[PDB]
Symmetry: D2
């Protein structure tokens, strides 16, 4: 009767997800990977940490999909990350094929799961995984905007010298160079950033620099680490989406969600604000854009369509 | 070397403060009261709960002010609460005299404390306590707006069917019938309430009703309980202010703060958004009002001045 | 789909239970009482605190038993507490009649609940409540030994100057003057207290005094407070039992449990170590006593039988 | 005024330490490493995660020791880990030289720190680091026994089907093949394992197998992962030691501590139960052994002396 969380991919993000699921006592955890030994190892290491922190959760590792049977939530990091110099879209060839296998494992063994996709390029990969798996669209989502928004919140907290708890950010669109941070709908304690520029708490130029740093955030971390990409903030972000589902919190979070008409878009995953509860993606919050925001969003969406055509370009079934 | 928190008043709020200080592992706790036995009892009861939850904190009870020596934070609930039918301003006669004694105990034994006043009527009582005690104005604050704002957040979370974590409220002014909730600076995930009315997520009339329910919130709880007033949400609210100080979080919180020129006011405590860190009230966020907000705020402040004149009206020293 | 916790009695312990259930995010809460207004008030006050701490839980108050429908856990504090000068057994007359009504409300509206009884005198009241309600015996338990054990742990932590996290206590029998703390099965970091006396970390006489202080602990708190009895540690204790059920933790806790043969006893509730998980009381840990421990336990059990005969003495159905 | 934690080594354990220090809100964090980019990257990634979980902590990365200035706690993982086939003692050549540099950085820039050493082989490395650094012996400790004990607790929790919170383990000696788990001082809820065998809750043979699995635990994880050694449980373990210091918890934990006469040993670090508070290692709990335990402990200590002679064998200063 505890919730069961299956982690497909037991790498950098996958391990961090497992550790956090325990610390937050979200349920039992299964780590799945094709490299044998790795998920069993990480599973046992985290299990062995549990008595120090006092959390009760069962941990196991597997390389067979039957291990995921009946999972309440499935989080997918399987595939490859970027190296310095690469865009996320350079990962499609390898990663699309991974989503195909993963999707078949979910369809067969955890068809009632809430599935959170992280593998990049995210808006394309999650669209793919939903098709391959055949799960209902409200039960399949992509983690991106919560990460982007959390980066922006960090930079803003630093700039204004305030608690991260009292900063809000709204970032929509692709998880891409062209994602759209909405300065008008980002706040300190409810006061929009555009108002804070007026009050002199910051400048326009500093605000623009933070928007740009947000757009380039993933790359900034790749360039520092060199051997891989970010994993702490991606993991935290997906975990918040998972907790909202498992605890029916109805968090409002920017996630790559399937649109049927919202924002005038039909049939794609795109980053938008969504309510997440026990029924999955329960509602999309459709804001009214001004002309500049609308332009940036249309462009972001065009990139996503570009990527989706590239996925079809290379795979029969899609 | 652990932080020491002194709780002046060991009643309904006082006990709840103590319990929360332990659960959040904020430090050692001293409960102070004039009714002997009560603070010792509550102290020992909470101490005895600690092994169940795993928090290490020393707890003691006293009716001598020397017990508070060297406290890092002092939270004052001493005095009397309302009964059904009373306004908060009916409490001045009794409560002003309490602040006089409390202020003298702080001045003598915990002069370097960060002091959070809760005793009502709050904007008057905290102004009094700061004068009686002589502590620097940035080290003395009133808990009110965080409570008011949290009520509004609850009502809003209910209305929109979203997580309390993703709702923001901005309530300024007196802790009074005329406090000012700013619908324009209250949000769901960064989207102002005024925009949500437009989007049809709620109505103007429902929004107005929630503003009113917020203004009358304290009374609503008095009328239900009958034997006393609210204590869980007041306690939680003060504890968040205390934690921001002790952990240097720089939370942005609406609190009754001493103004020297901000909002065009000099020499009063009034509810405004303030940054709280290791140096106390570190900054006041002065927003730009429209004409209606400015009118409501001027009125709220006039009530506060009314009450302050009533305190002088009845006490030589002030 | 969140768990639902019904709190029967919305007094001192009842309110504290509600507050803790939220803070630990255990589920939705219903407070039930016969004094109208009180459970609605406390419910709304805690609901209003929630945005400060970030927990999502629905709170309501009621005086009709239909409100408890479908509760996963029910915690019963309804009845009356002691005043200075009284034993717990002086509460039977009033409290037995309360258990009768409560039992009928559970039988009708939450027959699949895990029920934790707190109302005193506890070993008698829980035996009663199980009969009146007709629920399976593994789904009905009494909170006592966790409280007694936590008091002992506090006193021990103080004595040895160590963390409460690293102290263990084993207290069996009645929740009464004659409860049995087992010094041999109480420890600091795994080292029995009897060994610590030998090592000189404490003395026999200090150890005996702490055993006695534990036996008299409830009274010590009554005498301090004067208007009522302990509520923080009782509430924490029951909450740990509830969490073990709801999260299937399989905590090993001393609770008043129904015995069918364990410890050579059949047909009574007595304080023993039990494993609590998703199926209720899952196992009883039956330790081997030495002659002194066996004598103390037989006596404790005789008191419990005394009290049960007194309950039959005054009620047809039992 | 927040506590400052310096992490010397920003690898697998180092990163995990940083993440946990934030989640537990222990203070500001500096990650230090010789590979440039790595500590800056991990620091920024964790900083960027913070708004998701609500913790306020400053994070930075450095490859200059001046960055550690004034740290309250320093945790050292710098050096190299094992690959499959190696013992921990095969790491001395490289790691001793690392401790020399680290020790000089601490001596110069954080001489008032509480220093927790993790780098293997641990009992030798921490003895070295204390000499190189010259800090007082009560301010320098090795993390090992908490890890070993937590592995044993996991295996035991599994075996008995009980919560990890209610299992205790006592493991002394070297962090080595010959560490000494004390079955007599390990417990479920206060009942020794030797008593549980008698009660039939487990068998002698299963107990012996779990003792052995504990002794080989590090290797078991190396063999699974292949590219490195355990990091989640080592990190959790050190963090508990750090928290006990920073919050003056007085946890009783088995750690590699400097002995002056305890256990009849003078001048070495060996794994023993110690009280950790604001003054560092405050007390050693010296238990009385039976003849078998004494034999195992003397042997464990002889290995440690072996390793210390090997360190002198290869370095002038020691
Ligand atoms: N077909 C597969 N099935 C299951 N697991 C797989 C498969 N192919 C690869 N894996 C595993 O997926 C894991 C990916 O882990 P990392 O390489 O450490 O990458 P991480 O940093 O965890 O990123 C994972 C994904 O998330 C995105 O942020 C990133 O761009 C990448 O696409 C590896 O352990 C790898 O063995
Ligand atoms: N001079 C005094 N010094 C110290 N303590 C005092 C004094 N006078 C009264 N007290 C104590 O102050 C405590 C107040 O507790 P409660 O009556 O339970 O009131 P509570 O609900 O805790 O409200 C406290 C205060 O906060 C406001 O919200 C409310 O309007 C009231 O002013 C009581 O225990 C009372 O003995
Ligand atoms: N028949 C009833 N049905 C429902 N609720 C009832 C009934 N009779 C009384 N109550 C309520 O039970 C509540 C008991 O609360 P408190 O009097 O504050 O007592 P508390 O300290 O909460 O103790 C409760 C119980 O637990 C034991 O520790 C103690 O000895 C007492 O038996 C009160 O709010 C009271 O209105
Ligand atoms: N002289 C040095 N100064 C600072 N950092 C160093 C130095 N030499 C190596 N490092 C860094 O120490 C870090 C060690 O990290 P990992 O190799 O990932 O090893 P980890 O699993 O973190 O183990 C660290 C240590 O703890 C023990 O458990 C283990 O046996 C090893 O000795 C690496 O990032 C490495 O760059
Ligand atoms: O950018 C990447 O390669 C990984 C990722 O999704 C992020 O860091 O934003
Ligand atoms: O209103 C009162 O009497 C107590 C209080 O400050 C509140 O509930 O808002
Ligand atoms: O003793 C009482 O009256 C209440 C109780 O159960 C305790 O404090 O032990
Ligand atoms: O064994 C190792 O190499 C690392 C370590 O200290 C452990 O896992 O016990
Ligand atoms: Ca726990
Ligand atoms: Ca539309
Ligand atoms: Ca703890
Ligand atoms: Ca101004
Ligand atoms: Ca939360
Ligand atoms: Ca038997
Ligand atoms: Ca927080
Ligand atoms: Ca000795």
């Amino acid at each position: 009767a505890r919730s069961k969380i299956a982690l497909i991919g037991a790498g950098q993000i996958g391990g961090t997800l497992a550790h956090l699921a325990g610390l937050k006592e979200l349920g039992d955890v299964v780590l799945f990977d094709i490299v044998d030994g790795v998920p069993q190892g990480k599973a046992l290491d985290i299990a062995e940490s549990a008595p120090v922190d006092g959390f009760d959760a069962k941990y196991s590792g597997a390389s067979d999909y039957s291990a995921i049977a009946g999972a309440d939530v499935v989080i997918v990091t399987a595939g490859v990350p970027r190296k310095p110099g690469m865009s996320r879209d350079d990962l499609i060839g390898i990663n699309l094929k991974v989503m195909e296998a993963v999707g078949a494992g979910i369809k067969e063994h955890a068809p009632d799961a809430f599935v959170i996709c992280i593998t990049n390029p995210l808006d394309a990969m999650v669209w793919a995984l939903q098709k391959f798996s055949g799960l209902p669209t409200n039960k399949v989502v992509g983690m991106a905007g919560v990460l982007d928004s959390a980066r922006f919140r960090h930079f803003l907290a630093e700039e204004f010298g305030v608690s991260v708890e009292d900063v809000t950010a709204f970032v929509l669109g692709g998880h891409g160079d062209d994602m759209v941070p909405l300065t008008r709908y980002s706040t300190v304690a409810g006061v929009p950033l555009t108002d804070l520029v007026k009050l002199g708490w910051t400048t326009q130029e500093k605000l623009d620099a933070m928007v740009e740093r947000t757009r380039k955030g993933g790359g900034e971390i790749v360039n520092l680490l060199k051997t891989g990409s970010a994993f702490y903030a991606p993991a935290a972000s997906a975990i918040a989406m998972a907790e909202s589902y498992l605890r029916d919190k109805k968090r409002v979070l920017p996630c790559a969600a399937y649109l049927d008409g919202q924002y005038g878009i039909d049939g794609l995953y795109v980053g938008v604000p969504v309510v997440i509860g026990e029924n999955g993606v329960e509602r999309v919050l459709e804001v009214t854009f001004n002309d500049d925001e609308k332009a940036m969003f249309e462009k972001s969406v065009n990139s996503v369509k570009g990527l989706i055509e590239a996925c079809k370009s290379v795979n029969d079934k899609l």
